[PDB]
Amino acid sequence: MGSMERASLIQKAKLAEQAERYEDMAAFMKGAVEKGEELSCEERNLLSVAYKNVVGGQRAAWRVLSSIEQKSNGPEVREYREKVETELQGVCDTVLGLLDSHLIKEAGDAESRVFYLKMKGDYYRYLAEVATGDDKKRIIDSARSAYQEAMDISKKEMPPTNPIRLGLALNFSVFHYEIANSPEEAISLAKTTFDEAMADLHTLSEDSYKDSTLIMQLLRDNLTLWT
Amino acid sequence: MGSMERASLIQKAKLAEQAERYEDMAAFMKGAVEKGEELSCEERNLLSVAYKNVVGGQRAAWRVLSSIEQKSNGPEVREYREKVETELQGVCDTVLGLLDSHLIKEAGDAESRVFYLKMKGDYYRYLAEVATGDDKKRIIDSARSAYQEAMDISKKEMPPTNPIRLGLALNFSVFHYEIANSPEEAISLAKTTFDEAMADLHTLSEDSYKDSTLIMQLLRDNLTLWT
Amino acid sequence: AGSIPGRRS
Amino acid sequence: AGSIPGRRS
Ligand SMILES: *Cc1ccc([N+](=O)[O-])c(N2CCOCC2)c1
Ligand SMILES: *Cc1ccc([N+](=O)[O-])c(N2CCOCC2)c1
């Protein structure tokens, strides 16, 4: 995308979202990141939406194929599951590479730095979902380390109702429950996050209240499933 | 896909359908066609499902972008609509090329020949949806000619309740209404098709009755919208 | 209006 | 269970 203007890449990413062309959207946003400038709040959201949709389709396909493969146990199911898995890993490596070159190092404000470190935790988490063995251990630790740095910043620099802080806590709790075999840590984090947000809702406008309570309901939904 | 066994391509196309990986499914079925053997009934259905899903996503995206472009009237919306349009045309040309090299010429039974000629009409119809000008006229005539040959065979060789015959008539009626500016021909074809199928339902088993009445309801749904 | 949906085997 | 859906801007 080197020959396209940054502003045109951003405009086309928004059009691709409306057209539900998420692979295109991700390619446009990768091109925008590679222009080398920092991303605004809205541009960060476009980057995240694009790749979340791409990797989300891959994860859903991998789960279907992994289930069929487990039931079977010719080479075809394993070969095709491996093909999807390699593609998924490639997308995760691409996102992680954008974060490392050079989005995180240039992110100084809490809102940008927390957002990117949460993304780093998420994409290592998606790698962990398909990893097998000792490779799994180092990938799991990379996810944990990114989430933990984001949590430390968010608790120092953001109010407990901030939607990014809430979504980080939600996703770190899912990491604990689904990846790290720590369901008690997942439940404790979700409960403490919910309760501290509740106590801060009185400070918010009607619109901010709506944004925060929407994510709080997701924390509650997980707590209901886990307890 | 030249190095993969035909049977493995078919198996992987079925897995790709279950995983909702329709681009993969279409690539596997293209590879299977290119082995040079005729396709069974089930294999023809896999080919059609794969490409229908691929082109269906492209058509939906093209319609979103075309609507935005019409409302606007920078170059970005037009450029991106053109990109999607070129990709859509490439998929249609690929399908048409498989039919021409060499699926139609080897199809001697009515069920296979009607199926492929209906596909030929459909993919020329999708080309016509995005065509502008005199190119539109020849593309429209190519769709009409394919549908007409399929209709002539189907009326001679298949009962009026045959699902392929019914779906051909449904899609040719849509061609008349949406492409050829012939709504009266569309309505007449849908009505005659429905009525002649009704009168033949008494000959069918419970399972065949269900298959035929499902497509008859689609004819009725169009008639309700058009009258 | 509606053609054959045809998106499921 | 459920992470941030995050699939719509
Ligand atoms: C063109 C046509 C007519 C009928 C049917 N059908 O009875 O299912 C189809 N199917 C093709 C395979 O995918 C589902 C639709 C197509
Ligand atoms: C990680 C996170 C937390 C909160 C929100 N949010 O309040 O919307 C998001 N969004 C990112 C952009 O797409 C929708 C979700 C993400």
Contacts of B109 (CB under 8 A, 6+ apart): none
Are A170 and D6 within 8 A, CB to CB?
no
Contacts of D9 in chain A (CB under 8 A): 14, 17, 42, 45-46, 49
3-class secondary structure per residue, B81-150: HHHHHHHHHHHHHHHHHHHHHHHHHHCCCHHHHHHHHHHHHHHHHHHHHHCCCHHHHHHHHHHHHHHHHH
Q: Whose CA is nearest to atom 7 of ligand 1?
A: B163
Are A21 and B76 within 8 A, CB to CB?
no
Among candidate residues B13, B89, B110, B128, the one with its CA nearest the CA of residue A80: B13
Structure tokens at B157: 């060789």
Among candidate residues B141, B37, B47, the one with its CA nearest the CA of residue B94: B47
Contacts of A222 in chain D (CB under 8 A): 1-2
Test the D interface: residue of A170, A179, A187 with most D CBs within 10 Å:
A170
Residue A1 lies in a domain: no
CA distances from A154 to A111, A193, A209, B80, C3 (A): 8, 12, 19, 38, 52
Contacts of B156 (CB under 8 A, 6+ apart): B110
Residue A89 lies in a domain: yes
Residue A148 lies in a domain: yes
Among candidate residues A78, A81, A14, the one with its CA nearest the CA of residue A42: A14
The CATH number of residue B21's host domain is: 1.20.190.20
End-to-end Cα distance, chain A: 48
Are B174 and C7 within 8 A, CB to CB?
no
DSSP state of C2: -
Find the Cα–Cα–Cα–Cα dihedral A146, A149, A154, A157, rounded to 10°. Answer: -140
To the nearest 10 degrees (0 to 180), the angle between helices A110-130 and A134-157 is: 160
Domain hosting B208: range is: 6-226
In whole angstroms, give the CA distance from residue C7 to residue B115.
15
Collapsing DSSP to helix, strand or coil, A5 comes out as: coil
Collapsing DSSP to helix, strand or coil, A39 comes out as: coil
Of B49, B171, B226, the CB nearest to C3: B171
Contact C6, B225 (CB under 8 A): no
Residue A194 lies in a domain: yes
The C-alpha angle A122, A158, A114, rounded to 5 degrees, equals 25
Cα diameter, chain C: 22
Which ligand is located closest to the Cα atom of residue B218?
A: 1
Contacts of B215 (CB under 8 A, 6+ apart): B163, B166, B167, B170, C4
Report the number of secondary-structure helices (H) and strands (E) in chain C.
0, 0
CA B137 to chain centre: 19
Using CB atoms, which chains have 3+ pairs under 8 A with D? A
Resolution of the structure, angstroms: 1.4
Among candidate residues B20, B129, B34, B19, the one with its CA nearest the CA of residue B9: B34
CA B82 to chain centre: 23
To the nearest 10 degrees (0 to 180), the angle between helices A41-72 and A22-33 is: 130
CA B116 to chain centre: 9
How many other C-beta atoms lie within 10 A of the C-beta of residue A211? 15
Total of domains in chain A: 1
Residue B165 lies in a domain: yes
In whole angstroms, give the CA distance from residue B122 to residue B91.
12
CA distances from B80 to A44, A194, B66, B140 (A): 22, 43, 10, 25
In whole angstroms, give the CA distance from residue B211 to residue B197.
12
Structure tokens at B49: 């499902």
CA distances from A87 to A46, A76, B21, B147, B200 (A): 21, 17, 12, 40, 50
Among candidate residues A126, A135, A211, A139, the one with its CA nearest the CA of residue A174: A126
Collapsing DSSP to helix, strand or coil, D7 comes out as: coil
Which amino acid is present at A71? K
Chain breaks in chain B (C to N over 2.5 A) after: 73
In whole angstroms, give the CA distance from residue A149 to residue A121.
10
CA distances from B190 to B123, B180, B219 (A): 20, 15, 6
Which amino acid is present at B125? R
Contact A160, A193 (CB under 8 A): yes
Contacts of B147 (CB under 8 A, 6+ apart): B117, B118, B121, B168, B171, B172, B175
DSSP state of A175: I
Q: Whose CA is nearest to atom 1 of ligand 1?
A: B167
Structure tokens at A211: 């944004």
Contacts of A1 in chain B (CB under 8 A): none
Residue B1 lies in a domain: no
CA A33 to chain centre: 17
Of D1, D2, D9, the CB nearest to A45: D9
DSSP state of C6: -
Contact B59, C6 (CB under 8 A): no
Helices (H), B131-205: 134-157, 163-174, 183-198
For the stretch B43-47, contacts whose Cβ atoms lie closer than 8 Å and that sit 24 or more positions apart, written own/partner, are B43/B10, B44/B112, B44/B115, B44/B116, B45/C9, B46/B10, B46/B13, B46/B14, B46/B17, B46/C9, B47/B98
In whole angstroms, give the CA distance from residue A58 to residue A91.
9
In whole angstroms, give the CA distance from residue B170 to residue B160.
12
Residue A156 lies in a domain: yes
Dihedral sign of CA atoms B39, B43, B161, B126 in order: negative
CA distances from B174 to A101, A219, B8, B124, B167 (A): 51, 48, 36, 13, 11
Residue A30 lies in a domain: yes
User: How far does residue A26's CA lie from ligand 1's centre (Å)?
Assistant: 34
How many other C-beta atoms lie within 10 A of the C-beta of residue B184? 10
Helix, strand and coil in chain C, % to nearest 5: 0, 0, 100
Among candidate residues B80, B56, B82, B91, the one with its CA nearest the CA of residue A18: B80
In whole angstroms, give the CA distance from residue B149 to residue B172.
11
